[PDB]
């Protein structure tokens, strides 16, 4: 009714291509630690 | 004035004092993006930010980018 | 010789090392390259994860080789 899965999946799909989490909370802390740590340290 | 970057690159900006804890920053991030306090992680210089500490305890001063990483 | 270090994030720098160089030096090589302290690095090659004191010769690292990298928190 509100949101079952497809409208959450169809989005979840499209971010993985765009390799991006926090728009739809897609990727994991695991992978985002890598980026955030690689960014924060290099930046 | 400190930025809060994300993996998408949604650079949301915050205005908090050096004396303000990271607890406040979690609550201020809540105000901006609806995200519980215990499910956020803020990185700076490849170093984890604790709750009890303030921006003065670490070397965070001004125009400082703060990389956010959520957990499920 | 010239080897490669592959992050999980997608970044890939090429290095200029020698067989007799230690793993600490290689991690310090990354540091001046991309700004990462040695204490926040896990170099992975030939299945094992590489110890600090030993050299690239000890782990048999060829030329044009890929050493995978993970950042420790």
Pick B44's closest partner by Cβ from A22, A32, A40: A40
Please say whether the dihedral angle defined by the alpha carbons of residues C19, C23, C28 and C33, taken in this order, is positive or negative: positive
Cα B54 to chain centroid distance, Å, stands at: 11
What letters, b where the CB count within 10 A reaches 16 and e where it falls short, cover A3-38? eeeeeeeeeeeebeeeebbbebebbeeebbbbbbbb
The domain of A3 spans 1-43
The whole-angstrom separation of Cα B12 and Cα C68 is 33
Q: In total, how many domains does chain A have?
A: 1
Q: How many CB pairs under 8 A join A and C?
A: 28
Name the residue in chain A with its Cα closest to that of C9.
A35
Method for structure elucidation: X-ray
Q: For this experimental structure, what is the resolution in angstroms?
A: 3.0
Q: Are B40 and B29 in contact (CB under 8 A)?
A: yes
CB-nearest to A21 from B44, B65, B70 is B70
């Amino acid at each position: 009714n509100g949101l079952s899965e497809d409208e959450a999946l169809q989005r979840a799909l499209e971010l993985s291509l765009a390799e991006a989490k926090p728009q739809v909370l897609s990727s994991q802390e695991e992978d985002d630690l890598a980026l955030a740590q690689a960014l924060s340290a290099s930046e | 004035q400190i930025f809060v970057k994300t993996l998408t690159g949604k650079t949301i900006t915050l205005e908090v004092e050096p004396s303000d804890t990271i607890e406040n920053v979690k609550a201020k991030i809540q105000d901006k993006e609806g995200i519980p306090p215990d499910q956020q992680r803020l990185i700076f210089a490849g170093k984890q930010l604790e709750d009890g500490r303030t921006l003065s305890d670490y070397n965070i001063q001004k125009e400082s980018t703060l990389h956010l990483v959520l957990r499920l």
